[PDB]
Structure 1
Amino acid sequence: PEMVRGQVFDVGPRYTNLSYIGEGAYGMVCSAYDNLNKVRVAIKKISPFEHQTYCQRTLREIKILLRFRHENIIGINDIIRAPTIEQMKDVYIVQDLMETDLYKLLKTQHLSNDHICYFLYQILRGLKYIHSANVLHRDLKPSNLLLNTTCDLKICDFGLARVADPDHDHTGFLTAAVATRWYRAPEIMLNSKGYTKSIDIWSVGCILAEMLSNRPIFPGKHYLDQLNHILGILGSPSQEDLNCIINLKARNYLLSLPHKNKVPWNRLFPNADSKALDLLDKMLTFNPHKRIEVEQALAHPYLEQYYDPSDEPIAEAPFDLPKEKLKELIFEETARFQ
């Protein structure tokens, strides 16, 4: 086989010329030359079968990415597994090679308002599709957004995606957790298991702010610190927002806090397009019910020059196990690439 860093990467013969790109996932990601398509591709190696949770995230993701077909969602071009379940140690997900991601890009570049508008548009275009299939991404963040050399954007990492379940959304104060802290909607830390689409919009809202300033807008250092960050900018929620929080621990935590007034975005972002600040405003709304939805976000004037519903597709149809059957389902699900 071939070896990258110091580890076996068994993707011959079609995929050659393996350069190390990074970690994440259940480990290694590499560029490789796809001999059949004569193009370099990304290959991530997964060894998930040791604990159930990785078999779950790997399964969720493969199931979803196979069903999705969208310019702004990453997709899977190939999967390399052993020919028998007994011999299957690893799964190799083959995907398109992308120059960078929004995380790296933000660390080094000032984005123009045109790149911001186009990036945002693409995010929302992709998100519209995902939501229309009734799936939530639940972990949108700049590192989960990949750009190619031509600034084409693709959402990746559906490891934590769930099917939307707004009826089953409620939970107690501080019940936690799992999605990246900085991009978590405030109701995750109060009264939501994050089963509503409004959860993603918040994230996109946080991504938009990060694009305006190259800094995360709510860099809370720990669980509850996140909330005072958010509250610090948006201000104390009103009477009506509070009433929507029936859970007493959460509501009384909010009441115990000192009054903070709203900081206007134009003060936080003096150079930004005012249309962007308006949309920003509607996305980072404390009350998730009052929070804008993806299709109104698309129709917002800030996006006017890209907005075209006939070129913004929706899915043609919508959407607790031992790691044994999981390994077995993964095998069954990866069969079509044998």
Structure 2
Amino acid sequence: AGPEMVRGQVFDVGPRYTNLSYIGEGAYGMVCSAYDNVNKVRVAIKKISPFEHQTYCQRTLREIKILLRFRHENIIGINDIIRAPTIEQMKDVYIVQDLMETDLYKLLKTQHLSNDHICYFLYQILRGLKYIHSANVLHRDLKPSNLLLNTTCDLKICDFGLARVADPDHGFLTEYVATRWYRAPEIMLNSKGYTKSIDIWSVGCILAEMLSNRPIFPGKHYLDQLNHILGILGSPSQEDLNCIINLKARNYLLSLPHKNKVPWNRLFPNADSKALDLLDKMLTFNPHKRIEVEQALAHPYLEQYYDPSDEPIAEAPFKFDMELDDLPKEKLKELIFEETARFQPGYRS
């Protein structure tokens, strides 16, 4: 035989991994399930081919390094990585992970979630996020499609290609993503002093979506998204407005007609009132007032699962070997080659 091919995509992962089956794809990778002939179990394998562009190499290095370092129950791990023995031959990287049964996106398209499952899924998202933030890292791209699930109701966050080390006084500009509907307003307004609070907003959007099986702030353009946000939260108060840098967004916001706040129980008449209370606090326009991940976990909505003694944090802040932003793609390729060497046959530490 030869290399198995999934949907015209060659997956050169044999002979260890065989019997490939398509399970999904994003804007950057194609994911298959495969049989691990060493561990006698089926696994997930994402193929990416990033080396022609700096930003794609960033995604690959960021995801690999962060996931190899992180250890948490609600964060997908990386078990293995496949690539060519020499750097010149390396065109593709294959990331091997635990096979999760589905993701929240697919689930929400096929069924409704019970009020209890919504609560528990939210709990696990926030539990994983607490660990991420404690490592001084921003995920920056939380969405239903990268919350992986098993039917046992275990949830794991994946897809860390856009993740950065927190730094307010310092990665989205023009980078293609499949969906922008989970992004905080300050990102759309380009306020540019982003904090952990952008992740909390995404979680808010995800909670509202679990509650209704609809995105709360869709739109083709940021203009439309922002208008959807204001159409529900109402015009920002003066106090929020002058909490903003720049001026161009401020004045656009000031140029806009007044819009009243729409009561959450009008949007979601049948949602648990405690869920709506937490939703209001996550979907706060002013990022400085938006609830923080540790406070979110302690909110009455999550009381059945809240247990600070079993909500672990990272031992230390995460750091790349150096800031990645200005590294040429050629250099990033070397760094990816080196980070992946440990999974090569015959490798010694």
Q: Which bin holds the TM-score, normalised by the shorter protein?
A: over 0.9
Quote the Cα distance in structure 2 between the aligned partners of 1:176 and 1:9: 26
* 1:175–1:237 Cα change, 3 Å: farther
* 1:89 Cα deviation after fit: 2.0
* 1:325 Cα deviation after fit: 1.6
Residues 15-26 of structure 1: pairs in structure 2 closer than 5 A? 15-26=17-28
Kept after mapping to 1: 8 A contact 2:170/2:193: no
* 1:54 Cα deviation after fit: 1.0
* 1:6–1:179 Cα change, 3 Å: closer
* 1:317–1:179 Cα change, 3 Å: farther
Quote the Cα distance in structure 2 between the aligned partners of 1:274 and 1:163: 35
Quote the Cα distance in structure 2 between the aligned partners of 1:86 and 1:282: 50
Kept after mapping to 2: 8 A contact 1:139/1:179: no
Residue 330 in structure 1 maps to residue 330 in structure 2 = no
Kept after mapping to 2: 8 A contact 1:160/1:179: no
Quote the Cα distance in structure 2 between the aligned partners of 1:87 and 1:50: 13
Quote the Cα distance in structure 2 between the aligned partners of 1:56 and 1:175: 14
* 1:246–1:21 Cα change, 3 Å: closer
TM-score normalised by structure 2 residue count: 0.92
Compare 204-213 and 174-183 and name the one that shifted more: 174-183
Runs (4+) off by over 6 Å: 173-177
In structure 1, list runs of 5 or more residues that go unmatched: none
| 1:152-177 Cα distance to aligned partner (Å, 9 max, x none) | 111110111111112239xxx99999
| 1:229-255 Cα distance to aligned partner (Å, 9 max, x none) | 100000011111111124221111111
Q: 1:126 aligns with which of 128, 151, 163?
A: 128
Quote the Cα distance in structure 1 between the aligned partners of 2:174 and 2:58: 21
Quote the Cα distance in structure 2 between the aligned partners of 1:99 and 1:210: 20
* 1:176–1:263 Cα change, 3 Å: farther
| 1:47-78 Cα distance to aligned partner (Å, 9 max, x none) | 11121211111011101111111111111010
Kept after mapping to 2: 8 A contact 1:56/1:326: yes
Quote the Cα distance in structure 2 between the aligned partners of 1:285 and 1:93: 36
Residue 211 in structure 1 maps to residue 217 in structure 2 = no
Q: Which residue of structure 2 lines up, in the alignment, with residue 248 of structure 1?
A: 247
Kept after mapping to 1: 8 A contact 2:19/2:35: yes
Kept after mapping to 1: 8 A contact 2:58/2:332: yes
Quote the Cα distance in structure 2 between the aligned partners of 1:218 and 1:38: 43
* 1:191 Cα deviation after fit: 4.1
Q: Which residue of structure 2 lines up, in the alignment, with residue 9 of structure 1?
A: 11
Kept after mapping to 1: 8 A contact 2:27/2:177: no
* 1:174–1:153 Cα change, 3 Å: closer
Quote the Cα distance in structure 2 between the aligned partners of 1:3 and 1:236: 52
| 1:16-43 Cα distance to aligned partner (Å, 9 max, x none) | 1111223325442111011222111000
* Secondary structure of 2:20's aligned partner: strand
* Secondary structure of 1:30's aligned partner: strand
* 1:193–1:178 Cα change, 3 Å: farther
Quote the Cα distance in structure 2 between the aligned partners of 1:202 and 1:261: 20
* 1:158–1:280 Cα change, 3 Å: same
* 1:261–1:175 Cα change, 3 Å: farther
Q: RMSD of aligned C-alpha atoms?
A: 1.9
Kept after mapping to 2: 8 A contact 1:19/1:30: yes
* 1:221 Cα deviation after fit: 2.1
Kept after mapping to 1: 8 A contact 2:140/2:162: yes
Quote the Cα distance in structure 2 between the aligned partners of 1:226 and 1:75: 33
Quote the Cα distance in structure 2 between the aligned partners of 1:281 and 1:45: 38
| 1:124-171 Cα distance to aligned partner (Å, 9 max, x none) | 0000000000110111110011101211111110111111112239xx
What's the % identity of the aligned pairs?
99
Kept after mapping to 2: 8 A contact 1:176/1:188: no
Quote the Cα distance in structure 1 between the aligned partners of 2:69 and 2:174: 32
* 1:261 Cα deviation after fit: 0.7
| 1:111-131 Cα distance to aligned partner (Å, 9 max, x none) | 111100000000000000000
Kept after mapping to 1: 8 A contact 2:191/2:245: no
Residue 267 in structure 1 maps to residue 270 in structure 2 = no
* 1:95–1:176 Cα change, 3 Å: closer
TM-score normalised by structure 1 residue count: 0.94
In structure 2, list runs of 5 or more residues that go unmatched: 318-325, 345-349
* Secondary structure of 1:179's aligned partner: coil
Compare 182-191 and 112-121 and name the one that shifted more: 182-191
Quote the Cα distance in structure 1 between the aligned partners of 2:176 and 2:61: 20
* 1:228–1:191 Cα change, 3 Å: same
Kept after mapping to 1: 8 A contact 2:234/2:260: yes
* 1:27–1:198 Cα change, 3 Å: closer
Quote the Cα distance in structure 1 between the aligned partners of 2:278 and 2:221: 27
| 1:88-129 Cα distance to aligned partner (Å, 9 max, x none) | 221110011111111111112111111000000000000000
* 1:91–1:41 Cα change, 3 Å: same
